[PDB]
Amino acid sequence: IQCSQRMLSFSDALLSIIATVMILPVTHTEISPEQQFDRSVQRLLATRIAVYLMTFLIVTVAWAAHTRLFQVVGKTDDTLALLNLACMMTITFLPYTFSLMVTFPDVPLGIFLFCVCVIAIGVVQALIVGYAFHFPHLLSPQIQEPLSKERVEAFSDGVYAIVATLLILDICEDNVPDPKDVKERFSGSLVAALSATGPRFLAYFGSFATVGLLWFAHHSLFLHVRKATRAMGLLNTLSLAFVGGLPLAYQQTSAFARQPRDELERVRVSCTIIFLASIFQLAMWTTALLHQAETLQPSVWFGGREHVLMFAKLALYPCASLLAFASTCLLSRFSVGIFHLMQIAVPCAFLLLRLLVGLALATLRVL
Amino acid sequence: IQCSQRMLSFSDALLSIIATVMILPVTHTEISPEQQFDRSVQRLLATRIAVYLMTFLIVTVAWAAHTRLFQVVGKTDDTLALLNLACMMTITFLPYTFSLMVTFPDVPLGIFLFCVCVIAIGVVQALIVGYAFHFPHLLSPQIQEPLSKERVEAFSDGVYAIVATLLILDICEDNVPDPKDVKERFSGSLVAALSATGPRFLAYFGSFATVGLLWFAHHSLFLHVRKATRAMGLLNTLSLAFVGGLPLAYQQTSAFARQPRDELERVRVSCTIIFLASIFQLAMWTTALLHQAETLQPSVWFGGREHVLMFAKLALYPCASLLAFASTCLLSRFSVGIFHLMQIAVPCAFLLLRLLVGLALATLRVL
Ligand SMILES: [K+]
Ligand SMILES: [K+]
Ligand SMILES: [K+]
Ligand SMILES: [K+]
Ligand SMILES: [K+]
């Protein structure tokens, strides 16, 4: 009998990467002035967005089934490990079945291979169940509906890491020039080029800061979580689905970004994505506050020491993005600058969150 | 005081992905008959290969420094978590500095920004050390040279997962056709197309099986490892570096694959990569057998129950790849078929490894 921790971690990594890499087609969508107000391509963009959403949700359902199964298994074996690898192999093909369905929705091939993949996952999981039940020692101690916190955390970490990787790759592929366009830039000089490249580098830092602070909020929340509800699982799945779309909000090479659009509505889109990624973490926290006793640790209960701190940590980004959107709709003038300033202010607020919360609540105290 | 497990797992995931995604430039290298025997582009391919190797090794050195640091830290904090995120952000930029150096090696800009990134990583880690030492409770229990097995395992898992993702993405982007080339294929019929697409799908299954079986061997080895040596760490780093090159051996869209080359030498290249990825795992095992007492569990010691099983598990792929290369050099006729057959036989051998080993050693016993 062997421990199953590492195998499940590998499965979580693979599944998270598979669910998150469906955003690349969306980033690669190209609209330029040839189709400025073309309806077909403009709705094609939303088509690809929705396709990404559904593929992510399907892969997440598969991951949840895997979690429920290896909650029952408990201890792994060589045969069980190879069967798990087969299941991973079958799951990895679902994105391809969707990728064949997108181009020819009416012709039934994609239908056929998608159903085949699903039924194959089913038979593989059933074989795992049978092999485990045949040998008692391979079953869980209790058998021999909460989700597992470790698997949720691993999936979330994988998604966030893949997002950051996408950002850095965008930068690396855009900015790096080659010679003759270099000396068409300047006196064969790449220092002038470099500082003509600086805002791009610093934008990368800003986007990575956004993603890392969202991960920090999720990590702080789940450090204080005793048990993970199914509702919290759904809300985390939605939060991660909208986190996967952050590259679309922060990218330069992406043919999505290279399209005719004003600064104000790009700010609106980015703030929409950020708000949707954050409000679901806040919703997880609110839902857990419903039965703290089973879902939360005593420190963050109503009237606890770190209750206000956690609430502020989770409500920082929602409020900032919402007020930036409100600036877009209200001011009409200083919106892009307000977005830039928010991307700078939120990190420092996270760094000095404790002092801010303390002095703020004292102020509210005596006045 | 908070637990540092999840933060370190996230760091490992990010670093593994960053180290492994440098292979994409190598896959995207394009050579076609315009430059059939051009020396410049042919050596440019090896240039990009070496660049990938060095970038991987540098990122691995950074990851090892991070491991050594948070071996001393032990318990994390909000400030320490944000500083760790800053360190990750700084490390993610190293691939970009190399990406700017590749195009202009002589101009000193890449030099400058690479040195700046390294010194920034240094100051961030020094600040973490100082903040930790200032507060005793944030230090390790003992302080208040073996590597950590958990971090090694996480890094390896990330690398393998990224490789599998690259493979599936290759398939998805190549094969999916669009309409007018569909009905240029056939009677507007995508079933004929599909079975004109089948060898590609099944090649994906084969490559994923290769990667998953290598991961299975690594997992079985490290399940029986009590302590991880520095030499074992170096050998694992080399094994992972050559594992990252498996997509180059198994890919179809990659402009690397779409170049003039015979089947025999492509087989040779793939078998070379596989042998280099496997011999280093076998070397880790041999090195650990030098001081089993501290590095290995009793079950796999000389004369143990699972000693022969582990040796066979780790020597399966090396011998198969070596004999396929030997077929290429000797037979000259049946080499490609032998490679295809090996890609089928090795998995089943892994599935029936125990029975094979048992009956083989009994045979050798009485005869
Ligand atoms: K884990
Ligand atoms: K991961
Ligand atoms: K881990
Ligand atoms: K990983
Ligand atoms: K990628």
Numbering used by the authors:
A (entry chain B), B (entry chain A): 30 to 173, 254 to 476
Task: Give the exact sentences the study uses for this entry.
Transmembrane protein 175 (TMEM175) was recently identified as a constitutively-active potassium (K+) selective channel expressed in lysosomal membranes responsible for establishing a membrane potential across the lysosomal membrane. TMEM175 is evolutionarily distinct from known K+ channels, displaying a unique membrane topology as well as lacking the conserved TVGYG selectivity filter present in canonical K+ channels such as shaker K+, BK and KcsA. Consequently, the density map revealed that while hTMEM175 is homodimeric, similarities between the two 6-helix repeat domains result in a pseudo-four-fold symmetric architecture.
To investigate the mechanisms that govern hTMEM175 function, we collected cryo-EM images of hTMEM175 purified in 150 mM K+. Three-dimensional classification revealed that two conformations were present among the imaged particles; class 1, which was resolved at a resolution of 2.6 Å, and class 2, which was resolved at a resolution of 3.0 Å. To better understand the functional states of the two conformations resolved in our data sets, we next superimposed the class 1 and class 2 structures determined in the presence of K+. Overall, the two classes are very similar, with an all-atom RMSD of 0.9 Å. In contrast to the rigid cytoplasmic side, differences between the two classes can be readily detected on the luminal side of the channel. The luminal loops between the transmembrane helices also adopt different conformations, with the loop between TM9 and TM10 undergoing the largest change. The comparison revealed four overlapping peaks in the class 1 maps and three in the class 2 maps. Identification of the ion-binding sites enabled us to tentatively assign the two conformations as an open state and a closed state.
